[PDB]
C-alpha cells in the first residue's frame, strides 16, 4: 500500500480502456453489435437506422 | 418521366424498393427529391382486342 496512488492511476487508465473497448459489444437499441450481421440481413434503407 | 406500368407495380416506383421493373429498366436514386404522379388510364390505353 506504499505505491497505491500510481497503481490506482494505472488501474483507472486500464479500466477506462477496457470499458471503451467493451462498449463495442453493446447494441444501443440496434438489432446486433456487428455491422456485418446488419448489412447482410436487412436492405440498404432499413439498416441505415 | 412518362411511362406505363401495371397497377400492382406502382409500389416499385418508390426509392429503395425491389421488383423486376424497379431493378431492370427503371430505378430512382436514394436522394430523389420530387413527387410521383400516377393515374388510371384503362379507358384510354387498353384496347378491347
From Swiss-Prot, chain A:
The chain holds residues 943 to 991 of 1273 of the full protein. This is Spike protein S2'. Subunit of the fusion protein that is processed upon entry into the host cell. Mediates fusion of the virion and cellular membranes by functioning as a class I viral fusion protein. Contains a viral fusion peptide that is unmasked after S2 cleavage. This cleavage can occur at the cell membrane by host TMPRSS2 or during endocytosis by host CSTL. In either case, this triggers an extensive and irreversible conformational change that leads to fusion of the viral envelope with the cellular cytoplasmic membrane, releasing viral genomic RNA into the host cell cytoplasm. Changing residue 27 to K: In strain: Omicron/BA.1, Omicron/BA.2, Omicron/BA.2.12.1, Omicron/BA.2.75, Omicron/BA.4, Omicron/BA.5, Omicron/BQ.1.1, Omicron/XBB.1.5, Omicron/EG.5.1. Residues 7-49 form a coiled coil. The gene is S.
From Swiss-Prot, chain B:
Changing residue 47 to T: In strain: Omicron/BQ.1.1. Residues 6-8 are annotated as: Integrin-binding motif. It comes from the Viruses. Binds to host ACE2. RBD also interacts with the N-linked glycan on 'Asn-90' of ACE2. Cleavage of S generates a polybasic C-terminal sequence on S1 that binds to host Neuropilin-1 (NRP1) and Neuropilin-2 (NRP2) receptors. Interacts with host integrin alpha-5/beta-1 (ITGA5:ITGB1) and with ACE2 in complex with integrin alpha-5/beta-1 (ITGA5:ITGB1). May interact via cytoplasmic c-terminus with M protein. May interact (via N-terminus) with host bilirubin and biliverdin, thereby preventing antibody binding to the SARS-CoV-2 spike NTD via an allosteric mechanism. Attaches the virion to the cell membrane by interacting with host receptor, initiating the infection. The major receptor is host ACE2. When S2/S2' has been cleaved, binding to the receptor triggers direct fusion at the cell membrane. When S2/S2' has not been cleaved, binding to the receptor results in internalization of the virus by endocytosis using host TFRC and GRM2 and leading to fusion of the virion membrane with the host endosomal membrane. Alternatively, may use NRP1/NRP2 and integrin as entry receptors. This is Spike protein S1. It comes from Severe acute respiratory syndrome coronavirus 2 (2019-nCoV). The gene is S. The chain holds residues 398 to 446 of 1273 of the full protein.
Amino acid at each position: 500500500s506504499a505505491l497505491g496512488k500510481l497503481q490506482d492511476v494505472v488501474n483507472q487508465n486500464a479500466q477506462a480502456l477496457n470499458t471503451l473497448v467493451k462498449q463495442l459489444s453493446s447494441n444501443f437499441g440496434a438489432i446486433s453489435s456487428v455491422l456485418n450481421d446488419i448489412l447482410s440481413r436487412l436492405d440498404k434503407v432499413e439498416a441505415e437506422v | 418521366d412518362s411511362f406505363v406500368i401495371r397497377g400492382d407495380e406502382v409500389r416499385q416506383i418508390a426509392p429503395g424498393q425491389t421488383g423486376k421493373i424497379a431493378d431492370y429498366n427503371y430505378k430512382l436514386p436514394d436522394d430523389f427529391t420530387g413527387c410521383v404522379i400516377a393515374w388510371n388510364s384503362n379507358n384510354l390505353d387498353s384496347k378491347v382486342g
